Amino acid sequence: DNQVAEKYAQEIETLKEQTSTMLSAACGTTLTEKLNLIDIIERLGIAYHFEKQIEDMLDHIYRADPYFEAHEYNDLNTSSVQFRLLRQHGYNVSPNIFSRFQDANGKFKESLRSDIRGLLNLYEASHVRTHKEDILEEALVFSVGHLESAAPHLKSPLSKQVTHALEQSLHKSIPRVEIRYFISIYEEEEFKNDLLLRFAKLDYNLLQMLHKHELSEVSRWWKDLDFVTTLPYARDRAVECYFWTMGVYAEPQYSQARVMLAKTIAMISIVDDTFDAYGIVKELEVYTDAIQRWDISQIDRLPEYMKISYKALLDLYDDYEKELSKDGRSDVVHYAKERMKEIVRNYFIEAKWFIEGYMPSVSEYLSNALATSTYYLLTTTSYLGMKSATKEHFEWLATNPKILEANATLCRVVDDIATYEVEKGRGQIATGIECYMRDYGVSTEVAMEKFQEMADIAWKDVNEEILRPTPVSSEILTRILNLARIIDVTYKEKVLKPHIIALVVDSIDI
């Protein structure tokens, strides 16, 4: 409602100003409490109003006391929270800061097992680890053991937080989903800031109104295309397509970006349905070629049912160019278009393997299947609606940089792990787990562990690629991180349904 949103926005304006003042006057507070305020504001989801301000405070913290000496760092919780925040914001702080909580043989002190809060934040900090950080490997095994054993006697909401954290860590979760969860936690606390809490609830509800509005636009666009009238076997799933985009960015300024990303995801869906409709290779062949050539002149080459998706592909990417024209960014669209061509090529390749009954080696499989994860296309498309994403960012993306490869690898391997424990054989025999078994001459258990390891490695790659100096800005990288987060949670189905409801259906009671 127009006037409910206005009321929210008005109060938020003032609450924002009071919170900015609150961050300014954490200047003369202990480190522990500066960290707690930032952590609370960030987890309440209102940190985006204060981006540069928070980023300056953290930068200062990183530079002020680099060899975490002085007495506050004797506190596990303070060290763990600073470590996580700094690493998440791209500051390459050494896990050597945890050395003091360890004795001779690199084992964490048993005396720490009574500090549940500290253990919890130690745990969260450990999931930001990258390669060859054994201290953090040890922190993970150590905190997990003690948190699991203490949970039965913990009171709420701390008990809740611990259980939740153990199932999926903060750093590897969908930000908006965690924000809604953390708001419920903070509500339940006794010593909370009622202003920040109210600010967080109003801002969540206001953002959600925008999100419902965007979803309506996506949904009306889909209905206008009228696919289910011409392709009645096509999946009618616009909501699911739009949902992913709230995981990539929730903030108001990425509104145009979400709607654009939403539409490409829906079009991917339509291209999948078109590929799988008959599976007649001669048809897939001309479809694929027509897409590579990408021109309306090609539409007459196609079977009738394929003309439908082809014109809508073409119209969609035209609209993108027209829409960005206002900002002189029409020229970035062809980078997303290229990823769309790429995925169709790879769709064709696996279709043919399937027909030929060919089982690719792991290398051949991955060479094809990173793209069919859609994550090159989805990543690239997430920048179409961001004014701050320039030609140089798309040029970078085109090089298939490490963080993108890791993102897609994560998505591919975690999907393959999930779909093997189910469909096992038939498919598409040529699933990734089956390919590994045959290629390396190992069993299913071993093939599974290797895919699990590749996901772990993917996470470590991402966690390292976000540490400064970075090749592109934190804002650009956070879209890729967020795509990693979404796929990790999804495959930990209608696994997303309670999240759809929390994000786009149910408002928070004020």
Side-chain angles (χ1 to χ4, degrees):
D1 183 24
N2 274 275
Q3 299 292 54
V4 178
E6 275 302 309
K7 187 173 78 178
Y8 285 169
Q10 274 172 28
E11 182 167 2
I12 288 171
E13 278 302 294
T14 303
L15 291 178
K16 180 205 309 202
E17 196 193 24
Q18 286 166 337
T19 302
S20 189
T21 303
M22 205 178 298
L23 283 164
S24 282
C27 61
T29 54
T30 71
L31 168 73
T32 294
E33 64 214 345
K34 288 199 304 184
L35 295 178
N36 204 46
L37 179 58
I38 295 175
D39 197 29
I40 291 321
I41 285 170
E42 281 191 345
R43 296 169 175 249
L44 283 175
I46 42 176
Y48 70 103
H49 296 288
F50 320 103
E51 288 267 331
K52 191 65 187 303
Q53 188 177 2
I54 287 172
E55 194 59 65
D56 286 339
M57 295 169 63
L58 288 177
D59 186 285
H60 186 286
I61 290 175
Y62 178 50
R63 311 299 177 181
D65 189 351
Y67 298 78
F68 296 29
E69 60 188 320
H71 183 263
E72 351 296 318
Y73 291 114
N74 285 97
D75 174 79
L76 177 64
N77 192 78
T78 296
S79 297
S80 303
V81 174
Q82 172 160 319
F83 183 85
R84 176 167 55 80
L85 296 184
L86 292 186
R87 290 277 289 235
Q88 285 184 312
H89 287 252
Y91 303 97
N92 184 14
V93 49
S94 171
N96 284 0
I97 73 159
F98 288 114
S99 289
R100 81 189 79 199
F101 307 106
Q102 302 178 295
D103 47 53
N105 55 12
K107 303 290 177 197
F108 276 80
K109 300 178 178 181
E110 281 303 291
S111 64
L112 300 173
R113 71 191 177 189
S114 58
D115 179 21
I116 303 310
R117 185 78 59 186
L119 289 182
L120 178 55
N121 283 320
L122 174 56
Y123 170 82
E124 303 287 20
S126 75
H127 276 287
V128 108
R129 73 193 181 281
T130 181
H131 306 280
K132 302 292 190 290
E133 301 193 299
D134 298 325
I135 293 169
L136 296 180
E137 295 293 340
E138 184 64 34
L140 174 59
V141 176
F142 176 82
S143 57
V144 158
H146 292 298
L147 285 173
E148 286 176 341
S149 70
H153 61 70
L154 303 178
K155 296 178 179 173
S156 198
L158 180 54
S159 64
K160 286 178 182 181
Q161 275 186 295
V162 168
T163 310
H164 184 88
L166 291 185
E167 284 177 20
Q168 184 81 11
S169 65
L170 177 56
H171 177 61
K172 298 174 172 160
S173 303
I174 303 166
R176 181 104 175 135
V177 168
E178 298 311 297
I179 293 323
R180 177 64 185 91
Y181 183 74
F182 188 74
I183 290 172
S184 77
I185 299 306
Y186 202 62
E187 165 97 32
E188 208 186 321
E189 307 277 21
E190 283 182 358
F191 230 149
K192 73 307 196 46
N193 186 306
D194 286 292
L195 188 160
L196 296 182
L197 176 58
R198 174 171 177 86
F199 182 4
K201 297 174 160 179
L202 294 173
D203 202 277
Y204 191 89
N205 287 352
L206 179 60
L207 257 43
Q208 176 180 80
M209 291 186 199
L210 173 59
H211 296 162
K212 288 166 68 66
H213 184 274
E214 290 162 5
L215 173 63
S216 300
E217 176 174 351
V218 165
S219 175
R220 294 190 309 275
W221 163 86
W222 178 258
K223 286 311 168 187
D224 284 344
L225 290 182
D226 194 28
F227 286 138
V228 293
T229 291
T230 49
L231 312 164
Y233 51 86
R235 316 190 286 320
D236 215 335
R237 45 185 298 270
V239 173
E240 293 182 71
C241 298
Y242 172 75
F243 174 82
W244 220 249
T245 75
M246 284 189 296
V248 175
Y249 19 43
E251 297 97 336
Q253 65 270 34
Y254 303 118
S255 177
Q256 172 183 21
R258 277 188 295 272
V259 170
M260 298 175 91
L261 179 59
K263 290 174 182 177
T264 281
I265 292 177
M267 286 305 305
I268 289 170
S269 186
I270 263 297
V271 171
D272 287 18
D273 295 350
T274 299
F275 256 84
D276 198 47
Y278 297 81
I280 302 178
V281 63
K282 297 294 187 179
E283 293 186 352
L284 302 184
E285 182 179 34
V286 48
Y287 187 64
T288 299
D289 184 56
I291 300 245
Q292 304 315 294
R293 301 196 70 85
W294 202 286
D295 193 86
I296 192 62
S297 56
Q298 294 283 299
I299 204 171
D300 287 322
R301 304 177 53 196
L302 307 174
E304 205 65 29
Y305 76 106
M306 288 176 152
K307 296 184 180 180
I308 303 303
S309 50
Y310 193 75
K311 177 166 191 281
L313 264 304
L314 263 53
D315 286 347
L316 181 65
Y317 284 86
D318 262 272
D319 291 348
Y320 284 165
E321 291 172 351
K322 288 162 164 63
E323 184 190 350
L324 290 187
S325 199
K326 311 167 174 69
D327 308 316
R329 293 180 65 253
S330 299
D331 177 76
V332 311
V333 179
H334 81 265
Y335 296 95
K337 186 189 300 189
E338 286 305 314
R339 292 300 194 177
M340 180 58 89
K341 298 188 180 184
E342 176 180 44
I343 200 176
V344 170
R345 291 199 299 274
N346 290 18
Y347 278 169
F348 183 51
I349 291 170
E350 66 174 342
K352 279 177 68 89
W353 287 346
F354 177 63
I355 306 304
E356 298 162 356
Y358 178 74
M359 176 88 82
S361 64
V362 173
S363 73
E364 300 162 346
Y365 173 75
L366 291 175
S367 192
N368 201 70
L370 284 204
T372 63
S373 79
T374 77
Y375 258 24
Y376 292 150
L377 177 59
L378 283 218
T379 295
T380 303
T381 303
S382 76
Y383 304 111
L384 289 189
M386 290 159 62
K387 216 179 309 290
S388 57
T390 64
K391 182 168 167 202
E392 66 176 340
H393 296 122
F394 291 96
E395 299 280 79
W396 175 73
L397 281 181
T399 69
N400 285 0
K402 184 158 201 191
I403 197 175
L404 180 54
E405 296 271 76
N407 188 34
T409 299
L410 181 67
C411 175
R412 171 48 58 209
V413 301
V414 178
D415 182 22
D416 285 7
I417 284 170
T419 64
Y420 185 80
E421 58 186 353
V422 177
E423 71 164 294
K424 304 199 171 310
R426 175 71 162 282
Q428 267 294 332
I429 295 289
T431 175
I433 295 293
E434 283 195 75
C435 289
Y436 197 95
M437 298 191 283
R438 286 196 50 183
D439 193 6
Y440 282 88
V442 300
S443 75
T444 302
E445 300 81 8
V446 173
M448 283 287 186
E449 277 171 359
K450 180 67 179 290
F451 266 64
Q452 282 286 3
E453 172 180 324
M454 297 181 64
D456 296 345
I457 292 177
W459 266 116
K460 284 165 188 185
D461 284 347
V462 170
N463 288 346
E464 184 168 67
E465 289 306 299
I466 67 176
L467 297 182
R468 280 181 201 85
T470 61
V472 297
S473 73
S474 167
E475 184 196 29
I476 299 313
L477 293 180
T478 297
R479 312 309 113 205
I480 297 170
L481 174 53
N482 283 343
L483 283 168
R485 286 164 165 170
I486 299 178
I487 202 65
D488 201 80
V489 170
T490 300
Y491 287 107
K492 195 59 185 291
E493 313 172 64
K494 283 187 169 64
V495 180
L496 293 196
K497 176 171 72 185
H499 303 320
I500 283 180
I501 289 176
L503 263 65
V504 120
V505 182
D506 285 342
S507 63
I508 305 183
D509 292 339
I510 300 306

